[PDB]
Design a protein around this motif. Structure first.
Motif, PDB file in Angstrom:
ATOM      1  N   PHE A 197       0.845  -1.188   0.000  1.00 24.89           N
ATOM      2  CA  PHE A 197       0.000   0.000   0.000  1.00 24.89           C
ATOM      3  C   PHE A 197       0.879   1.237   0.000  1.00 24.89           C
ATOM      4  O   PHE A 197       1.865   1.300   0.744  1.00 24.89           O
TER       5      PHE A 197
ATOM      6  N   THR B 171       0.718   5.618   0.199  1.00 21.64           N
ATOM      7  CA  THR B 171      -0.119   6.758   0.556  1.00 21.64           C
ATOM      8  C   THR B 171       0.198   7.946  -0.341  1.00 21.64           C
ATOM      9  O   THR B 171       1.299   8.069  -0.878  1.00 21.64           O
TER      10      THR B 171
ATOM     11  N   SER C 119      -3.318  -1.052   5.682  1.00 22.16           N
ATOM     12  CA  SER C 119      -3.285   0.300   5.158  1.00 22.16           C
ATOM     13  C   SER C 119      -3.554   1.339   6.238  1.00 22.16           C
ATOM     14  O   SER C 119      -3.237   2.507   6.032  1.00 22.16           O
TER      15      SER C 119
ATOM     16  N   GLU D  90     -11.397   4.357   4.482  1.00 20.98           N
ATOM     17  CA  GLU D  90     -10.316   4.455   3.513  1.00 20.98           C
ATOM     18  C   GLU D  90     -10.880   4.426   2.106  1.00 20.98           C
ATOM     19  O   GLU D  90     -11.877   3.761   1.826  1.00 20.98           O
TER      20      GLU D  90
ATOM     21  N   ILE E 269      -9.550   3.173  -1.153  1.00 21.74           N
ATOM     22  CA  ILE E 269      -8.471   2.369  -1.714  1.00 21.74           C
ATOM     23  C   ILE E 269      -8.596   2.352  -3.233  1.00 21.74           C
ATOM     24  O   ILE E 269      -9.569   1.827  -3.787  1.00 21.74           O
TER      25      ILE E 269
ATOM     26  N   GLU F 258      -7.064   0.772  -6.579  1.00 19.42           N
ATOM     27  CA  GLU F 258      -6.263  -0.336  -7.085  1.00 19.42           C
ATOM     28  C   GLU F 258      -5.369   0.114  -8.233  1.00 19.42           C
ATOM     29  O   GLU F 258      -5.848   0.699  -9.206  1.00 19.42           O
TER      30      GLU F 258
ATOM     31  N   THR G 128      -6.968   8.507   1.258  1.00 16.13           N
ATOM     32  CA  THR G 128      -6.637   7.927  -0.040  1.00 16.13           C
ATOM     33  C   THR G 128      -5.383   7.070   0.077  1.00 16.13           C
ATOM     34  O   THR G 128      -4.348   7.522   0.582  1.00 16.13           O
ATOM     35  N   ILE G 129      -5.500   5.829  -0.386  1.00 13.21           N
ATOM     36  CA  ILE G 129      -4.441   4.825  -0.377  1.00 13.21           C
ATOM     37  C   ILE G 129      -4.444   4.135  -1.731  1.00 13.21           C
ATOM     38  O   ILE G 129      -5.514   3.843  -2.275  1.00 13.21           O
TER      39      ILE G 129
ATOM     40  N   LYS H  97      -3.423   0.648  -3.598  1.00 11.59           N
ATOM     41  CA  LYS H  97      -3.084  -0.754  -3.391  1.00 11.59           C
ATOM     42  C   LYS H  97      -2.316  -1.228  -4.613  1.00 11.59           C
ATOM     43  O   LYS H  97      -2.847  -1.223  -5.727  1.00 11.59           O
TER      44      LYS H  97
END
Ligand SMILES: CN(Cc1cnc2nc(N)nc(N)c2n1)c1ccc(C(=O)N[C@@H](CCC(=O)O)C(=O)O)cc1
Ligand SMILES: CN(Cc1cnc2nc(N)nc(N)c2n1)c1ccc(C(=O)N[C@@H](CCC(=O)O)C(=O)O)cc1
Ligand SMILES: [Cl-]
Ligand SMILES: [Cl-]
Ligand SMILES: [Cl-]
Ligand SMILES: [Cl-]
Ligand SMILES: [Cl-]
Ligand SMILES: [Cl-]
Ligand SMILES: [Cl-]
Ligand SMILES: [Cl-]
Ligand SMILES: [Cl-]
Ligand SMILES: [Cl-]
Ligand SMILES: [Cl-]
Lengths: 328, 328
Positions: B42, B44, B115, B299, B301, B303, B324-325, B327
């Motif tokens: 993950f 950031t 995450s 979160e 996420i 992709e 916002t993350i 993956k």
């Protein structure tokens, strides 16, 4: 008893002008039991009055402190001849029931001007004392930047800082004021009106930056100083005299990236945060330092109540060397 | 072993756009003794990256933290399979000598997404914890204003404030973020984009003003809040995100008359002030509060590493519900 009073005829727009003020004469009523009649001896004019005036109604008396003498009394605690600090505003005579008056220190010698009770050994001096010692929190060895440094506040800041073992850099607005602060022991003094570059002057004055900033001026001057603060540097926000007379928007603030990554602590203060006992202790220190020669001073005494607007306007422009005081 | 890396192709003007970034593929050097090969799980994206990018040269890797897995190891302290926090920037694979890596809490459970180590139970959560508890110094019963309130910093600020017995007012940029923070227990939440008047909305939210301001936004928004701070009110300056993507003249600073009359204390901070020791205790507090349900989270996420610029831009613009993350 007749009195003369300066009133706000029109709210200030930019710098005050003569037409914004109106002198009125009136007769005060006889005293009631417990009241005193106060004759002004010395009246101060100070930058905060440019801001505080905005809360007045047109026709209201201009606010301010004076050294006054009891000339008639029906008050047991306040006999004729008593010298007090009072804030009836810009007036030659006033009636008080005694509640809000402050008495002169008993230590006050007849060897120093009573006008100092409105300056160096008064609210400006106390503003310097608490701002430097408690808000900047100097412990010794710091480098302190002080602006409006020849003012009644700034000149006390610098002299106390020297007593505490600090290095002091002072900015002033005239050549005579440079010599004054040189005489008072400031480490670096410069005339900000004539230096080529404020940024470069401050950098030469302290190449490794500033631990403490005693700020009387605000605006773009302060943006420049903030860029030279050390990490965790402390700013005591005492006044913002470069902004009080503004007619347009304020200058931009300092780049937040500087404030954040230097993790600066900025705290504003007014002397009245400190209560009576703490202020009395500090006033006694200030007076002892004056009598020891450790705090020197200058006064700009203007004769005549009728000149109080001119005194206020000259002070706001920085035209005068020393604390501006009107002698009734 | 290959890696993909996002670089700064062109310095940003205003907000970034896609053509400001360039994806590059390269072969990593072979591992030396004591080194590990890290595979991003993950990554950031965070507002500070917009400011930090200004200091990069075109072609440099974008900066940032990730949760990664050791996939090849010559370091006995970091065997294959170990999960770590690392900051190699926006890259899928990287080499480390291990010295600056951080394992997760020993008690990290499998019921909590990894995450979160980049959010609520990571540096944003720690920023919230120290900013509120130590810079604002909340003690219970205060009223807190927090902006960018639906990010990981803001949501943790609000929920810690509630568990300390404070009232919390939060400003967000979307109606979906209003609903989120209402479910999280914020007392008042508003969409700053749709209110008729920010001044009036803030006044209705807390008629007697604000004891503490946790400020992520800066600019004109903060000038408005400053006009509603209580006497001796405390401002924790965490970020100034309204300025990071702002073209044209910088915003004016706050009215000095208000700052001084209210005797405000305004201190900036970065989470790194608190050493690894105190950060660990705070991290344990955050994890425990998450497991107890006193701190909830959301979160967003995205992709695909190829979508990291898009993730950054949407995050900067406030368009994503939840931290916002990306993956990998
Ligand atoms: C009385 N006092 C405290 C102080 C500060 N802000 C206030 N603000 C308000 N609204 N009301 C007050 N009564 C008030 N009082 C003072 C008085 C003067 C200075 C001051 O800065 N005087 C100038 C005078 C400069 C000159 O005389 O040339 C100086 O530089 O020393 C500060 C605080
Ligand atoms: C790592 N860290 C501390 C921090 C702060 N400023 C820095 N600035 C620089 N230049 N470099 C750093 N490494 C840095 N680190 C962080 C990381 C994220 C957030 C943060 O505020 N994140 C947003 C994310 C918003 C979102 O995802 O919508 C939030 O509101 O939670 C703050 C501090
Ligand atoms: Cl005129
Ligand atoms: Cl009016
Ligand atoms: Cl008084
Ligand atoms: Cl000066
Ligand atoms: Cl002392
Ligand atoms: Cl820009
Ligand atoms: Cl916001
Ligand atoms: Cl938000
Ligand atoms: Cl939701
Ligand atoms: Cl006041
Ligand atoms: Cl705690």
């Amino acid at each position: 008893s007749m009195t003369k009073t300066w009133t706000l005829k029109k709210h200030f727009v930019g710098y005050p002008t003569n037409s914004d003020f109106e002198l009125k004469t009136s007769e005060l009523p006889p005293l009631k039991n417990g009241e005193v009649l106060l004759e002004a001896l010395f009246l101060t004019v100070d930058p905060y009055m440019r801001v505080a005036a905005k809360r007045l109604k047109e026709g209201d008396t201009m606010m301010g402190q004076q050294v006054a003498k009891v000339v008639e009394s029906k008050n047991v605690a306040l006999p004729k001849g008593t010298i007090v600090l009072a804030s009836p505003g810009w007036t030659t005579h006033s009636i008080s029931d005694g509640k809000d008056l402050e008495k002169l220190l008993t230590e006050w010698p007849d060897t120093i001007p009573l006008s100092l009770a409105l300056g160096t050994v008064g609210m400006p001096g106390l503003t310097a004392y608490f701002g430097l010692l408690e808000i900047c929190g100097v412990k010794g060895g710091e480098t302190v930047m002080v602006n409006a440094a020849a003012g009644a506040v700034g000149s006390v800041v610098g002299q106390i800082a020297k007593l505490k073992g600090c290095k002091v850099v002072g900015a002033v607005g005239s050549d005579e004021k440079v010599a004054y602060l040189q005489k008072l022991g400031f480490d670096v003094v410069f005339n900000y009106k004539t230096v080529e570059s404020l940024e470069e002057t401050l950098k030469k004055a302290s190449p490794d930056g500033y631990d403490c900033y005693f700020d009387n001026v605000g605006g773009e001057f302060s943006n420049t100083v903030i860029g030279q603060m050390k990490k965790f540097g402390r700013i005591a926000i005492c006044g913002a005299i470069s902004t009080y007379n503004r007619t347009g928007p304020l200058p931009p603030g300092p780049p937040p990236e500087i404030v954040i990554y230097q993790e600066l602590r900025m705290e504003a203060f007014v002397v009245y945060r400190w209560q009576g006992d703490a202020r009395q202790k500090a006033l006694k220190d200030l007076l002892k330092w004056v009598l020891e020669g450790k705090i020197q001073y200058k006064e700009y005494i203007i004769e005549g109540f009728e000149n109080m607007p001119a005194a206020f306007m000259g002070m706001l422009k920085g035209d005068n060397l020393g604390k501006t005081i009107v002698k009734a």
